[PDB]
Amino acid sequence: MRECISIHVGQAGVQIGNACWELYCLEHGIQPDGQMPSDKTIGGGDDSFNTFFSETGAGKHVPRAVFVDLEPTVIDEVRTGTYRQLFHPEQLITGKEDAANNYARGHYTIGKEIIDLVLDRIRKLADQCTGLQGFLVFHSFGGGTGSGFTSLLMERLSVDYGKKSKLEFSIYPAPQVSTAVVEPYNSILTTHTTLEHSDCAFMVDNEAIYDICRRNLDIERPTYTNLNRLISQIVSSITASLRFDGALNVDLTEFQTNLVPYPRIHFPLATYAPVISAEKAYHEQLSVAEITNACFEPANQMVKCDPRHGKYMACCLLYRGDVVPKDVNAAIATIKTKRSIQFVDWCPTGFKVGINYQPPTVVPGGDLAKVQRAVCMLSNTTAIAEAWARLDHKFDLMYAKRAFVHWYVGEGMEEGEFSEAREDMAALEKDYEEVGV
Amino acid sequence: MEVIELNKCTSGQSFEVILKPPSDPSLEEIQKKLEAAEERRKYQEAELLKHLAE
Amino acid sequence: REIVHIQAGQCGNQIGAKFWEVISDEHGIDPTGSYHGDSDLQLERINVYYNEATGNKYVPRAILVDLEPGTMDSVRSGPFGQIFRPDNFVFGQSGAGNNWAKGHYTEGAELVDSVLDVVRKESESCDCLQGFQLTHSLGGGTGSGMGTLLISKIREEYPDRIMNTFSVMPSPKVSDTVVEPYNATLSVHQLVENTDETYCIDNEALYDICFRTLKLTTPTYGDLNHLVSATMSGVTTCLRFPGQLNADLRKLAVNMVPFPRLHFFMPGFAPLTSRGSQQYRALTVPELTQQMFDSKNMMAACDPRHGRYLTVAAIFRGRMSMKEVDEQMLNVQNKNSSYFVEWIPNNVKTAVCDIPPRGLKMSATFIGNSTAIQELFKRISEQFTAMFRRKAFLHWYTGEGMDEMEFTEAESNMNDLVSEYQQYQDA
Amino acid sequence: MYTFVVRDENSSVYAEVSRLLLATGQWKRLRKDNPRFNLMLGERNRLPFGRLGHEPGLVQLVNYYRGADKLCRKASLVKLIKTSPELSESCTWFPESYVIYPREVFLAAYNRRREGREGNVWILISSEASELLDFIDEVHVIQKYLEKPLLLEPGHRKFDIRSWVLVDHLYNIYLYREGVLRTSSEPYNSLTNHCINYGRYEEGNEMFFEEFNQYLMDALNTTLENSILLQIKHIIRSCLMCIEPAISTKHLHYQSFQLFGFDFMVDEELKVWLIEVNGAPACAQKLYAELCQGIVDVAISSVFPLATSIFIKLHH
């Protein structure tokens, strides 16, 4: 058993972290007070769930997590919320004034004043791990803290824990739930700085989550609570292999091996099915073939893009519920006939399948209905580069006139860092095109 | 087609199905970068106070 | 995050008193300074504008400044006059005489340090201070001359705090003196450099709205300041009431100001409402949206169709369907794409507050950074140059020690500002 | 009001379509790079398909099908046919064609007929492989030249047929009832590009369907529908359905339609052959107004409504 540490940076990372750890507690039978009667090893153990939870002598099960934000409002609700007792007070780190949607202020001026404290709190977590595999970092592209501070932390973590894997859950900005006009700037800056320091990054476009909540949950105006609870289901699917017994994706290293053949191309697409409303009175439960076929519908992906106009480098199928391999293989054979699934020539056309028999857990009073089977597909397809082109085009429109750049240069940044970041993005887009066509 | 490495346990199973075969800066430089932005930010501040003094 | 409010001069103190009058009612605070309201939302962000006093008494974090005692004795006499802290009345005796030079260089120089003492004392008791809010006019002497001198002094002591002003611009239709273009041009040179956001409140627009739209035949300053007070309440709604944006003076500046000197905003309001006259029909979410972008609801006398919007912030107040507000706001951008710059994507931001302003069930406040504001500055420039080419009335200012070169510089800087707004109109 | 944007100024067809939309009074052309459009008449190259369908509150339509280039490039089309089982190896209606890059497959089948005395004249038309193959090195497609083209008289004139096809967002396949006959004015000797005499037998080397029908009747005792068009409808339908799963926008965040030009040649025994498919076609001058209004009717107004058809629906 090798431990994993979760780091939630900025408002988006913190609030998504709340929903994730709430879902983990329900999945593992841990009460809001930290007790797990399921755990018969009292005060410790090396079980699969101990990858994400540590044990105290009093039987309290504590997330191996740290929450950091440059402003106290969001994390304060965690301190006063349903899971107050779950976390140690030192685990929740807050600044005093936020980054004001400015990458430079989050990275340079305000970020440098708290970076040393965060690493020490992280080091306290690492010293209670017998074998730390790495970190899972939740943050937004758009916010000043989620952008500037995350890239700062990722650099120091590379120095201090150079042998450890680092995975990201990144929130891609969408105008439907936007907070700032300079979010394309923050997105390009943080991606450029973090690119070599991240081993695998799962991008979640807020636009995709928003439409899924409207279309499949019949919520006219989805809130952050609606989006995060759905996001946590996908995150839980991706991390379930770490917290439960299984043969597939058992350590963070395996994620890179299975999903990332080239280091720069380390953004796998996530597709999740089925998403069904709890308020739907009459619902017909979907089969293995139906949910697997849904994995190739762009309307169910975490980023809207067309995988038909790209190439696959890897494909993982993560099932939860009543699923047996013979149904999976029969469904895959069926899908192969009817859909455009093309791999690069130096990769085998194959799927890595993992099945967990316990069906997805849903929070009581939530929006998602209980389903008898679900699947999350992780595919590394070059089609995800459509999101890079969209963002880079928005960056170009503003930067051609140097709109808002004075806010960044005002905090010590230089205009050259903008062009340096954009050139790296232009190179990333070209790498995707060479592999994809 | 070909189903390989089937592993089972009471929680579930996992396997691979194959349809076709194939045909870092140091802490030092971090601080050099951060302090170089700090001097630019402090210089621009000193220009402000100089201009205000005029 | 707390704000320090400063009202200077006749115009500044009047609209300032009305502003405290309006928002105190919104927050349930009486003239005693005691909260007698029906919701906890009124108090959730009351610290932004109010200090807490013994016996749960709320005191505005406001400083009242003038070189003349009279208008401030009026404020004390006014309906909410006893709410203000007595130590925050700072006044001279001579007066500014509608002379920018007297406010900036001579008479105002004597009083400025006394104000900063009060500003310092208010700042020290702030947990996290966002910045400063100033209300003043640019056509007089105190609010114009001394108000800008205070802004320069405050920026020196607080260079990392936001500076925000409500600046009333002179119009010959509402004019006290021929020298108002001189005072305004000198003031704009200061504001272009020492403020982060300036709300351009044009007296010409306020007069026209009262005359043409509210059918007021002879509008008073009380009529004008009814429009200003409603606008100030709407523009500060996100600061005073909780929202999803977690809004502050800096994020507003970051998102609304693509270039540092183009920070002069066109405020707008709807439904346009006359004092006392009751509105019985509430407006529809489509009606609010069309009126709020209508030129006849702008508080700066500029034609938005003569320029382009760099950024826009819209604040809706009342119980309404946010889906409809989204659809309707999306409808205007899509219908009129030509008047929004394409090189700033998603440059329109919408916010909603459940609590409505007093006397209305539905209200909308508009804040726009449009290149059409160059029309207002061009108007001041033309009036300025008309006198300046003959050096008319200059002796009032050279008698206080000013030189002609300072006028040439202020004239040149404003024409520079006009050309910069022109540059991004064709970009 | 509806929004649209023009990004291919050389499109005679969509310049006509855009002027039609403006003249409806319910459409407004935007700046070329304004993202808030309802409709995009896009460029022919590097069209930013990944940017469509991400504007809140905006239904977006585009006059090109992403992935349709696989039908509209000679090397890809020839690949697509042989490699796809829908078009089923060597189907009857496509000439023997081979991808040779500036070789092994050519020699094996071709040499059989140079030995067998059957006419070996592939195509820049030669009969010796080395003459043409080594010449192309100064990608290319090597295609059998059908040496028995259909005789057209008076004049002994070789010809080719162009049919315009509109595919809407729902993947309805529409064949314009008016096809064009491009005529070679000079006789054949045992290329019909209008870009390469002219005007002797019919105007501008363009013969129409009402006329060519009567020639087929009077000369050959047959109908255009029975003799040729039945084969044409089958080839169009087979091609466009083969690629339907690859290019359909049925469940996409944006929508596609696209107008195509199909090229056929009819042999002596009245067999129809597919020459090429053109993703950017130009209509005949007489037919422009009728076709461009049909585009607006069925491709654009179907998605963006306002407040006897000219097409044949090829059913699938």
Ligand SMILES: Nc1nc2c(ncn2[C@@H]2O[C@H](COP(=O)(O)OP(=O)(O)OP(=O)(O)O)[C@@H](O)[C@H]2O)c(=O)[nH]1
């Ligand atoms: N999915 C999701 N997205 C969020 C959430 N909160 C914020 N965002 C998105 O994150 C982006 C803004 O980042 P924030 O996390 O709010 O900013 P921050 O990290 O706190 O940094 P600051 O600017 O200092 O406040 C916007 O694109 C929002 O749409 C959330 O709870 N869930």
Ligand SMILES: Nc1ncnc2c1ncn2[C@@H]1O[C@H](COP(=O)(O)OP(=O)(O)CP(=O)(O)O)[C@@H](O)[C@H]1O
């Ligand atoms: N196997 C074949 N047998 C007889 N003629 C052929 C032929 N293949 C092509 N041609 C002739 O070549 C001429 C033009 O060549 P090609 O078919 O490649 O382009 P095209 O007819 O579509 C005009 P463009 O290339 O400008 O769109 C056609 O008119 C056709 O008559």
Ligand SMILES: COc1cc(C(=O)c2cnc(-c3c[nH]c4ccccc34)[nH]2)cc(OC)c1OC
């Ligand atoms: C200071 O009081 C406000 C503060 C904010 C604010 O903090 C803010 C945070 N994020 C944004 C924007 C993000 N994208 C935009 C596009 C145009 C304009 C603003 C934005 N604004 C917004 C307001 O009005 C909506 C305010 O009332 C005047």
Ligand SMILES: Nc1nc2c(ncn2[C@@H]2O[C@H](COP(=O)(O)OP(=O)(O)O)[C@@H](O)[C@H]2O)c(=O)[nH]1
């Ligand atoms: N709305 C409004 N405007 C005023 C008021 N008093 C003066 N003004 C305007 O302000 C300018 C005169 O400046 P004023 O404030 O009176 O001079 P000061 O006391 O020296 O600052 C003129 O352009 C007037 O039109 C007022 O009460 N309400």
Ligand SMILES: [Ca+2]
């Ligand atoms: Ca245990």
Ligand SMILES: [Mg+2]
């Ligand atoms: Mg934040």
Ligand SMILES: [Mg+2]
């Ligand atoms: Mg006066």
